[PDB]
């Protein structure tokens, strides 16, 4: 559906074409897991160890941003689409989310320009409510589109192999090999789980980008 | 002039329109000698060719039967949603006279 | 030599020009014989054609009239906000003489 | 007329079906005098070429060449799943007749 | 043979090099009798055209006229940064002889 | 009949590869008269040509040159990694024979 989410980011729009979208801190395989994400603490939004997090609403964005990027002259609300690399964080860790009122979803990998549909600037702390759209942007592929499932995230927790989740339900029907060679085995899963994504992306995206063919003019 | 694919349609005999609403399963082509041809799927089991060009076809088609096979090729790809084709019904697979995207 | 599209509009007789800015919402495609040609429509309804190639049409304008038909199926499949349309407005739909994008 | 991959094969002598259900892992484009071919790859080393055009080739086939190394390309960079592809087995690297992707 | 566009402009009469370092504002395409052309801008309200084809061009620039409006179409719709431009100054809008892409 | 790029290479003498494994840096293309053209360049400063088609070439080689500068302007939009470039090496910039993409 055509639902949104939310993320302050200091980073301008100049920056995220450049880069492809709001990509994770370690990008520039980096460490893709859930659990540390979530628990990561610094003028960022949480965006450490591969995922990127956003909110469910503007209003719970701006509060967010004016809290860790307050200081910032001008920084930026990006406002993106719903997505299968988007986990609920409370849903995927349960009972160990360790920021449960924050109530995110991270994306997994980042979060690529095309799934960006616009952003806000916010000067002085001011919301301008004017919203900029992103050419990128794909409204039909998008609104087709929902976040992933929880029974989908489970098996990327990304708990260490200690802990009790890997023993408890919904988790140790999904536990990777060695949880419950864990933590290699939730990389290389986040790994797989990215590389099938991102291999979905390119094919709307570079597909479009080749519709200009005609093969009888030539 | 139709402004749409279903007058369009009206203007020829042998056809009709089929509405999918849905994007293409899949996409075949071919290179092989007399089927140098299209074939694509709706996941409803419906099938449709791109014919083989052909003394049925007037020189002016010759180009609009290549531009349907690179349209096709690419509404595949980018998982267009397809809203309707007119097709001719005297062929098997029902073959390809126009298509509408939209959705 | 026009700078812009309504310069450009201006230069004919027969036409004018359509303010969109909006991306396209049907794409329509005919290899039907003597109906070689585009449809495309926009959400407030407004119909617009790529003509079939005729005697209307000087040689110069042929390979144009295949580059707009390219040029509407990628603006419909990446969803490009289209800002105006030159047409002629003596035919029903209305006949693309030029197209302009912006962002 | 056939209406899927597996039956156009079986009309020709010397073909072959391959069921891949993947990626291409390389694509290779050369237009050095007498190799004015493209070979593909998969990863664990399945190698297919679109034939130099030649004698063996009638015009009908030509056309349809260029559009299967058009087709290879898109699907390299779009990272599209192959499904099958029909090959002449006559020829080393095998010869790609059709391709299918679905869906 | 030139390294790259800033020598190859240097080889002409009545050219210069434009410095952009930003993607197309827009861009616009005519398939209107005697103005087949595109028109580009770019934020800092620079202008240029693709020149009609006509007796000022040689055969040989007949296919490289029609790839530079492909190029531009394609750069646009992508947002890709153009570097630079090298055109010739004695015309209004002043034309495109080569584009340089990075970034 | 070659299985892979690097034998490719080997059937011509005034040949060499180079291996980049890299994306395109830059893309430049020409519709100058006689400069028709296109030149790559990498980060690492190495430079290719797509040659002006000229009396070395043979007629078969005319719509692969073309073919050439369709993928390297679309493997420099979408940043596919280049693996290898065979190319003439008494030519500067080298020239462009054959090129393999790979990750
Ligand atoms: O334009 C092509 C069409 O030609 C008709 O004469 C024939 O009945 C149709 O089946 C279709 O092939
Ligand atoms: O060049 C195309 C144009 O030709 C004119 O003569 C005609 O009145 C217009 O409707 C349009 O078709
Ligand atoms: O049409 C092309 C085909 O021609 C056949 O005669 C040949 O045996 C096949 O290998 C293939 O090249
Ligand atoms: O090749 C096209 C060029 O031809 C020249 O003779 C002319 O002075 C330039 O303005 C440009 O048109
Ligand atoms: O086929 C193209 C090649 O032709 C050769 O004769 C020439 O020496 C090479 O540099 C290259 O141009
Ligand atoms: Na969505």
């Given at each position: ?21 709001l990509?994770?801190?370690g ?8 659990y ?9 939004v ?7 997090s ?13 809290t ?22 409370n ?14 979803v991270?994306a ?9 549909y ?42 260490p ?58 | ?24 399963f899949?996409?075949?082509?071919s ?10 799927t709706?996941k ?10 052909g ?9 609009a ?10 509404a ?28």
């Open positions: 559906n055509d639902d949104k989410l939310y993320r302050a980011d200091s980073r301008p729009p100049d920056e995220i074409k450049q880069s492809g979208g990509m994770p801190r990008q520039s395989q980096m460490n893709i897991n859930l540390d994400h979530a628990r990561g603490t610094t003028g960022f949480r965006h450490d160890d591969g995922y990127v956003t909110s469910i609403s503007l209003r719970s964005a701006h509060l967010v941003g004016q860790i990027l307050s200081g910032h002259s001008t920084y930026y609300i990006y406002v993106i689409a719903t997505a299968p690399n988007m986990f609920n964080v849903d995927v860790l349960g009972a160990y989310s360790p920021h449960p009122d924050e109530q995110e991270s997994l990998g980042g979060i690529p320009y095309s799934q960006i616009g952003w806000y600037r916010v000067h002085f702390g001011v919301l301008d409510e004017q919203l900029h759209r992103n050419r990128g942007y794909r409204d039909r592929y998008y609104s087709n589109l929902d976040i992933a499932p929880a029974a989908d995230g489970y098996g990327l927790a990304g708990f192999p200690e802990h009790r989740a890997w023993r408890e339900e919904p988790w140790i029907h999904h536990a990777p090999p060695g949880c419950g060679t864990c933590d290699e085995k939730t990389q290389s899963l986040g790994v797989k789980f990215l590389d099938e994504y991102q291999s979905k992306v390119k094919r709307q995206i570079f597909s479009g980008y080749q519709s200009d063919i005609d093969t009888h003019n030539r | 002039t139709p402004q749409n694919i279903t007058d369009l349609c009206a203007e020829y005999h042998n056809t009709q329109i089929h509405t999918l609403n849905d994007k293409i899949s996409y075949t082509e290179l092989a000698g007399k089927r140098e041809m299209a074939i694509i709706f409803n089991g419906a099938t449709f060719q791109v014919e083989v060009p003394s049925q076809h007037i020189d002016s088609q010759k180009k039967i290549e531009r349907m096979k690179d349209t096709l090729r690419i595949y790809l980018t998982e267009a949603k397809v809203e309707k084709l007119c097709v001719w019904n005297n062929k098997t697979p029902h073959a390809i006279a126009a298509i509408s995207m939209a959705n």
